[PDB]
Amino acid sequence: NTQSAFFMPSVNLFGAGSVNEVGTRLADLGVKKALLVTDAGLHGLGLSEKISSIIRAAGVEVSIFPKAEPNPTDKNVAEGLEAYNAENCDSIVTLGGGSSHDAGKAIALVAANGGKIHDYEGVDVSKEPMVPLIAINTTAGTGSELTKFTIITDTERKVKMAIVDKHVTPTLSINDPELMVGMPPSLTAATGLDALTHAIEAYVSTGATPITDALAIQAIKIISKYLPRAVANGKDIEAREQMAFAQSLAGMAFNNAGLGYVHAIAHQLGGFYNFPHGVCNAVLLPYVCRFNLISKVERYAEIAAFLGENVDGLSTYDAAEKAIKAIERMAKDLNIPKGFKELGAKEEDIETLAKNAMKDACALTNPRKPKLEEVIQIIKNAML
Amino acid sequence: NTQSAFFMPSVNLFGAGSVNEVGTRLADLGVKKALLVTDAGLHGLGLSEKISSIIRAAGVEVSIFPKAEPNPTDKNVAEGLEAYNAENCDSIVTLGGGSSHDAGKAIALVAANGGKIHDYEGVDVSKEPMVPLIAINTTAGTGSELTKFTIITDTERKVKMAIVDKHVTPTLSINDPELMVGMPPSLTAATGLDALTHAIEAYVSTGATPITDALAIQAIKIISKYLPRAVANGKDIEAREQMAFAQSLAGMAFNNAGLGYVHAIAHQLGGFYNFPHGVCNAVLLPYVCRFNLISKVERYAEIAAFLGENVDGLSTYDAAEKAIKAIERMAKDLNIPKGFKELGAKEEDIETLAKNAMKDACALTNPRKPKLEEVIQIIKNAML
Amino acid sequence: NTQSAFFMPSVNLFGAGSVNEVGTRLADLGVKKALLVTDAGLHGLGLSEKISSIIRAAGVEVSIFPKAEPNPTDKNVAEGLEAYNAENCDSIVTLGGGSSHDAGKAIALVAANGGKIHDYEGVDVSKEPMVPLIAINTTAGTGSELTKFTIITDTERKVKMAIVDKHVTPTLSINDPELMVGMPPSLTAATGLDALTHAIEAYVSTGATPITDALAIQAIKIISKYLPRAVANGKDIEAREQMAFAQSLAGMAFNNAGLGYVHAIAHQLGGFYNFPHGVCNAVLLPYVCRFNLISKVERYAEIAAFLGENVDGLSTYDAAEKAIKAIERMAKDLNIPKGFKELGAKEEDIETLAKNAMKDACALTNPRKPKLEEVIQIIKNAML
Amino acid sequence: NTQSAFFMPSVNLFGAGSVNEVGTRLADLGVKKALLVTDAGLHGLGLSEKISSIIRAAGVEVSIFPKAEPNPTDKNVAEGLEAYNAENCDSIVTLGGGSSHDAGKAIALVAANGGKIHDYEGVDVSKEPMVPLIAINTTAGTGSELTKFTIITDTERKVKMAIVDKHVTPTLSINDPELMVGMPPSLTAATGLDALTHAIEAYVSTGATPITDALAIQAIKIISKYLPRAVANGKDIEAREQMAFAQSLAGMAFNNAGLGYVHAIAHQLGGFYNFPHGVCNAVLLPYVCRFNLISKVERYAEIAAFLGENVDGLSTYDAAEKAIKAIERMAKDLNIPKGFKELGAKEEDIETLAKNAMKDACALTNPRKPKLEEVIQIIKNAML
């Protein structure tokens, strides 16, 4: 069919100070006890208590679960579901980056569907809406506060599982850039390059629509102008607010268009080595774009212009090549590792990695359909 | 504040055949009896019964209220609320164009907050969310299946009141282009030019954000290419699908950025003389743009390029004027009336029309703030 | 469906001297006696006997029917079927322009399907293929030596009936440019502008395919260069050969894509006043192109370039308008009448002319679907 | 002489689902049982039975001959005539690529003329038309469903003989893109580049006409955009349909313009080593183009533009040179071998390969007339 759908939370708050509304919103939802899912760093920095104060200052109780781990695991989700159940909670508030949103989302799905998070790996495999959730985002690259995606790790298959289900669209989303000033430069760069990967893969995806296209183009332009500014000075408020907008645009686009083999392979490198998601995407992006070039050359040529390149007097092909060169230049200027072996990757895993990548749902929307030898060759090119 | 929010239904279905899902979707909400709000023409066409059959084949009861009138009235809403309660309905399904959507939204809001619809004229004045509502759109220009706007006419004041409330965001939207092939050319032109007005006013609004900008730009570009095609041949499926996308983009843009004095004045001409909304917008747009030019000249110059104009070697001012000339050219090619006098408007009503235009909420986001005399001059110029 | 088809004779001869092969070819078909259908002018010029000698010198008998009239009539077809049967002919050879080709096609169809040519007005209504027919084309504009179209006049309805049937595709075609040198200048101009109309209407028709587009583009480019040369000096052999190629390109294109309201209206003016077909087409072309503009503005802009115009720095709309101006200038340079009233058309018939125009099959493929009032407007415009 | 001719089947069906008509169309022709000529691969995939049912449901009997081999052989034709005479068949339906079309065509010719296939090597070396044949094409190259060319391999001389006879033009053709979705990527690339070779050799051929030029230009332009997309994802329906159009355009063009030394040499390399026809053409295309440059420098400069290259500020020579560079880049991006020795070509057979190529009929239309040394040198340059 030629049918499509657009998903996002019904209410999404933006701008400096929006977090000061969480409690009121939680009260309007008619909830009484919320599990605060955050990470140990943000809890140690004091964010958990500062936000809990706002929540309980509105008549809703909150119990903090600062046990969401970068690249969240099935163990984190099971332990959280116990907290949720033992702690008599009726809502979830996620505070942090994509790991906290996805952990809270998985907890919320299993708290309403019963099984294990692994049971819902795939597309809309769940059979009921998740418990009420307000997602407070503090990184500029996931968009998970708006998506129907939750990435939970199989520690046994060592695979970052993709649960893509409409029932994990958060109830309300909050994007406060004042909460993002504290991102160190490497984190700023990695999340920003994850948003850029989101927008590029959404723009070349087979599930693209004119709506997702509008959003992705804006995201690329804004990231290209403001991400280096956010990496160079995290106290540049303009760059922070524009990167928050760019992150939401890119999340909006990929949620409804689909991603591709950058994310398909990155999920395997992250399930095997706990590498940062955004760094995997940044290392892989130029190679997968070069692989995809012959399928979407006009759109990669447009991406080169969106990325600031001059394409006057150039063929569509040469213009498309300037886009890969600009991506490599951006990654070089933001100090992204050059390959995966310098980070700890091994050949004895490449074939397994490639075989697992061909099973990720994101691969379904990649514009060029590959043979195992191609995924393997891409992974080999990303080793050095 | 630098704070903002983005609102839209959590689930939005697109594409040929999407209406065949209404019953299952309505069932998933756990509702049991829906009032089907439509107009007399579409009910006489058999569409009401087709949709009622799909709904009943999913275990939900249906009571048809086919009495929404073009420019729906407070009387239509009161009668609809009476029907809603007499048949013990727990949900609403709107089928048709903006008049049916707004009648249904108003019925649902009054059924959940009490009072009368006039009580909610303004911005976020109600306290409770409206009863479950699914919106099935059949015109390519309103976007009300996605907006928090319901425009109901005060018959006594002769004023099309604008109720701007987050609580009238539909639960789910359905945009099936197969349901729009039957629009006669005049309706296609008026609805398409209402969507173009939506996108333009959103782009020049004081409430614009990078997100709304993305959506509005795509809407203008698509309307410029496909609206004349849809007017020339309504059986052009590609044009119908692109207009279905453009109408939704423009709705998404104005719902979250705001409108301006085109809509503020159009609501008064429609409350006084019951003209088609899009025809009022098409007549007024060049005049409000010229009035607004000095406030957003860079953005009107960009609009000229989005509309296909060549601006090489021109100042921003001359490029912005070329946009007004292109807007005038599209209206003439779509056989839009030249002015309001030949339609029946009277000079002695101008002063009241302008006064009421300054009380509409859409005027709050107009980039240039007028005084009464300038609103009067605009209406006099629009008499022609 | 997206299904399509390409129709053309299996063998099509081109080049100086090709007619000297007709007799051999007729004999290769296994036929024994052919009815030579031509018009009185070429018969008085001696061409009928010259070709009959070539045919007889190969053992095929010939009976000349020089009774085909410009804008052939139903009476011509009845008289031809009588001769075909009385003279014990088993094949048909048409010699001349479109009038002779269509008369021969009609006789050949009725000789195999019975009934009357009137019964076959419309699309693929016939059950049996027509008797073997070889078409020798002597004008540079109709293309009927290759098409599945036969235009026969219903003398009482005063309507040029369009029989579009695959069973009237000639068996073999001969396009000898040596036979076209004798066309007087007005005939060269009228047939060439009928070919230009074929290519333009094929390019903007809703039934265009990449194949028809390729042929139509080539036709337009060649006509812009060589038609004026062939009108200014009919002894320019290069111009005559290039115009023969262009007529065939335009015929192949319209035969498989469709025409539009130029032909739909021209058939009515020709059935009422027996004006030359190409003159009717040339008078109407600018007005129907202007009416259709909003439906195919990109393709009319491309036509402006094919016609040699410079479109640098122009919007698609201004470029499309330059094409209409180029058509008007060419028609003026070839002494094409400015309007229809000066030739004898009467206002009191416009309504009938319009109503009959909406019943012609060529109207089905026009890119803009009109109303009766708009067809009437096109004619009033073409009257003065 | 200045004479020319255009040949193609009188009825040619295109588009998704056209194959569903084979049976009904076989019903027109009045035939009773057809030998279904295909290859073992499509027979093992089930296509043979699928089509056979469509033929059965129209009252026509079918005998499947799935013994056509890639690079069909004389032996294959004899086995075929044996079965068509045995099952007492009166028609032939070819299902597959160029090998199935050419095998069936040869069977149909010898079944009507009696001799041996080797005897009709050359041009118009036959006396009577072949038996009714409908060709259903499943590859995006060759064009054999429309040509008067049958290439049968003589197992003795190791020579792909080119029989160019009008008596082998199929009765009806079917180009259903739904049957081409299953072509694996290497087959998509090889067939598409065989089509590109057809269009280029037709464009630079000495037998080119304005008609062949129109068709070949369109084919080159479409291939440049859609062949890489069809190789990258064979489930791209738009790319498959556009390539089906392109292969038909290139077939119509080369059939009536001629080919050149790319095909002349490729036929010998394939007769010696059974290499795929399209891979032979792709390896040879740049070297023969460079040999031909001085004869057709303007048309190679035009091909550079048709292929998407920018030629601004360049001499005709440098642009024609950019065209060969674009052909090389296309061959490399679609993984086409760089030379023939890697595939197994022998440096001892170069003298015979070159001598046999100058005896191919395809060399007669090459724009540059060479010496044996030149053909030898081309083959040597294509060895590494």
Ligand SMILES: Nc1ncnc2c1ncn2[C@@H]1O[C@H](COP(=O)(O)OP(=O)(O)OC[C@H]2O[C@@H](O)[C@H](O)[C@@H]2O)[C@@H](O)[C@H]1O
């Ligand atoms: N505003 C902030 N200031 C300082 N540090 C922060 C901030 N926000 C997050 N951090 C720190 O950044 C670390 C990484 O947190 P993540 O949530 O894992 O980062 P993110 O890229 O946003 O999420 C990625 C996760 O979502 C999936 O899409 C993806 O596969 C991965 O599982 C954590 O230790 C967290 O404390």
Ligand SMILES: Nc1ncnc2c1ncn2[C@@H]1O[C@H](COP(=O)(O)OP(=O)(O)OC[C@H]2O[C@@H](O)[C@H](O)[C@@H]2O)[C@@H](O)[C@H]1O
């Ligand atoms: N697909 C269709 N086919 C044929 N007719 C249709 C179709 N859809 C609607 N119509 C007819 O068009 C007429 C106008 O109906 P509206 O709902 O008023 O059309 P629309 O322009 O979309 O809504 C305008 C209303 O919404 C507000 O934004 C605006 O202020 C106005 O009140 C009605 O009589 C309706 O039957």
Ligand SMILES: Nc1ncnc2c1ncn2[C@@H]1O[C@H](COP(=O)(O)OP(=O)(O)OC[C@H]2O[C@@H](O)[C@H](O)[C@@H]2O)[C@@H](O)[C@H]1O
């Ligand atoms: N080569 C020629 N030299 C001199 N005179 C010629 C030549 N060819 C044709 N004529 C003269 O041109 C006159 C008109 O002949 P037509 O066949 O009517 O001209 P043409 O434009 O080719 O066909 C028009 C007919 O075909 C339909 O498409 C169209 O509707 C019309 O009925 C005739 O009197 C004929 O003698």
Ligand SMILES: Nc1ncnc2c1ncn2[C@@H]1O[C@H](COP(=O)(O)OP(=O)(O)OC[C@H]2O[C@@H](O)[C@H](O)[C@@H]2O)[C@@H](O)[C@H]1O
């Ligand atoms: N739609 C399809 N799906 C899957 N496989 C296919 C399809 N079509 C063809 N194939 C496979 O392609 C293989 C080669 O078949 P060919 O007919 O030889 O391919 P093609 O390139 O079209 O023909 C080449 C032959 O025609 C001559 O012009 C040329 O000289 C050569 O002999 C076979 O194994 C066949 O099964």
Ligand SMILES: [Mn+2]
């Ligand atoms: Mn990501």
Ligand SMILES: [Mn+2]
């Ligand atoms: Mn509006």
Ligand SMILES: [Mn+2]
């Ligand atoms: Mn004509």
Ligand SMILES: [Mn+2]
């Ligand atoms: Mn070939």
